[PDB]
Design a protein around this ligand. Structure first.
Ligand SMILES: *[C@@H]1O[C@H](CO)[C@@H](O)[C@H](O)[C@H]1NC(C)=O
Ligand SMILES: *[C@@H]1O[C@H](CO)[C@@H](O)[C@H](O)[C@H]1NC(C)=O
Ligand SMILES: *[C@@H]1O[C@H](CO)[C@@H](O)[C@H](O)[C@H]1NC(C)=O
Ligand SMILES: *[C@@H]1O[C@H](CO)[C@@H](O)[C@H](O)[C@H]1NC(C)=O
Ligand SMILES: [Cl-]
Ligand SMILES: [Cl-]
Ligand SMILES: [Cl-]
Ligand SMILES: [Cl-]
Ligand SMILES: [Cl-]
Ligand SMILES: [Cl-]
Ligand SMILES: [Cl-]
Ligand SMILES: [Cl-]
Lengths: 278, 278
């Protein structure tokens, strides 16, 4: 038995109409505490097995949202309260130094293990402090053990991208004038894990001496396989330029019968299919 | 002015007929030395701006190849000689403990920056020492500053694969009985660097109320782009399963006119094309 205490408490906020405001609040204890905040535009997002909670108001409408909000915490021992004030202005009423997003993040795809750098440039007076959110919850780069870090520019740099880094990112600029949210941007993390297989097999043929036949080989997969030709030991396709996906063996003037082999190959496998001219 | 001296000298060798034998020899000095070894099956391969040289005999034929070979080194100051003996046996005359390749390396494709591990398991008595060759020249893992290293198994592990790691690899087993070469294996290093573009554009249409039309979007590139649909702000394709390459928007019973947008997207770009139903 032990009463709960807040690891993080909510701060007061000054928002802009049409934009977003978020209030964060989590606590720890034994047994675990359960946090609660107290409408279509209001939404709650839990974390840390319910012990954390984020209130998100979007879009902001003034002065209806302009109130105080409490974050309670239930426990077998007791419960505590924490306050946080919301203010909301309109675009035509924003102070000169209110934060503005000059360049926000944008829809991006990153292949697994590669680096994703979610850009964000913001002005204001004083210069705003950039935080980031992902799936309506704040990003904590310090928790990543060096893999994720914010650059001096505000950019969120995600090295060694993994599947869980996929999600809806938005950069947030805060200063004494208030808080401005960017247009959201989805990050997609691409895994390429499909072994190569033939889509169009080479056809066997019978021909007269010269004797013009093209033989087509088409293979698919993710990554997309190279496709080269061989007649037994000797390979016809030169390495310098080897086709990906599709390779059509043009035979000009043929005299004797021979068996041609198509090899499709990627990092996930090698496949073979034979075409025999008679 | 300074005479030349050998950084590495050739060793005597015992080969097997049909197989390969290689003699290595390089030297250093001011001015630089130029090394020379002294037939269709004989070949020389230079390195270190000609100061290094490798004699390669393949295939071995006994007893015609069974001779002494010298590696001279020309220089303004003088020149030096180094000897090395070749012996060649037939398969039916191999000592019990002569090296054998149990599992050799094989044709492989590795994507750039990924790890390529060229396997090689060999038996013999005593147990043979594995060295590796690439494009008829020996691999020196110590030169890679940790990126390349031989495993205890004999495997050549190539981390952070780059374009120059592409080439023809063969593992070599050596012990007191002699030297055995494996079947060669090509390693291909795949770079995926083609920005996404549409191969089949969506078609505009005119329809009656219900009004069944499928709209096809096909894009290509390396890596291969995702392909999703949107009607302005709202995106129709669910994230969980998003098609790669091809996406065909089935419209069942339509009543009002609307503009549908196809977005193709990879790590190298985002492209858009619109289809308008009337
Ligand atoms: C094969 O393809 C080439 C290139 O398109 C063409 O010029 C040739 O006529 C074709 N020959 C056939 C189909 O026999
Ligand atoms: C090709 O292979 C087939 C099937 O094994 C065999 O029957 C045929 O003799 C071969 N033809 C040629 C020209 O090598
Ligand atoms: C569109 O494709 C689906 C699936 O193949 C098919 O069942 C349907 O009849 C098609 N409708 C069209 C072409 O209008
Ligand atoms: C679709 O866009 C075209 C081209 O901008 C525009 O002329 C048309 O009014 C739009 N139609 C609909 C249904 O939104
Ligand atoms: Cl807060
Ligand atoms: Cl900052
Ligand atoms: Cl923005
Ligand atoms: Cl297949
Ligand atoms: Cl040697
Ligand atoms: Cl070893
Ligand atoms: Cl082998
Ligand atoms: Cl295009």
């Amino acid at each position: 038995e032990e009463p709960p205490r807040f690891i993080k408490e909510p701060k007061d906020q000054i928002g802009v109409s049409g934009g977003v405001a978020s209030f964060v609040c989590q606590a720890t204890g034994d047994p675990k505490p359960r946090v609660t905040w107290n409408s279509q535009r209001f939404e709650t997002i839990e974390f840390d097995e319910s012990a954390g909670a984020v209130l998100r108001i979007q879009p902001l409408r003034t002065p209806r949202d302009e109130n105080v909000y409490e974050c309670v915490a239930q426990n077998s021992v007791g419960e505590i309260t924490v306050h946080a004030k919301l203010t909301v202005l309109r675009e035509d009423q924003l102070p000169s130094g209110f934060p503005n997003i000059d360049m926000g993040p944008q829809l991006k795809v990153v292949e697994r293990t590669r680096t994703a750098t979610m850009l964000c440039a913001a002005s204001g007076n004083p210069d705003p402090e950039i935080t980031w959110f992902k799936d309506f919850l704040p990003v904590d780069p310090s928790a990543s053990n060096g893999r994720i870090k914010q650059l001096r520019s505000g950019a969120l740099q995600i090295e060694s991208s993994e599947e869980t880094d996929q999600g809806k990112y938005e950069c947030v600029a805060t200063n004494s004038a208030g808080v401005r949210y960017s247009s959201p941007a989805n990050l997609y993390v691409r895994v390429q894990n499909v072994a190569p297989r033939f889509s169009i097999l080479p056809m066997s043929h019978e021909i007269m001496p010269g004797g013009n036949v093209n033989i087509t080989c088409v293979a698919v997969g993710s990554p997309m396989p190279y496709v080269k030709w061989m007649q037994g030991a000797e390979d016809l396709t030169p390495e310098d330029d080897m086709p990906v996906g599709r390779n059509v063996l043009e035979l000009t003037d043929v005299k004797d019968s021979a068996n041609y082999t198509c090899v499709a190959m990627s990092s996930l496998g090698v496949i073979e299919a034979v075409a025999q001219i008679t």
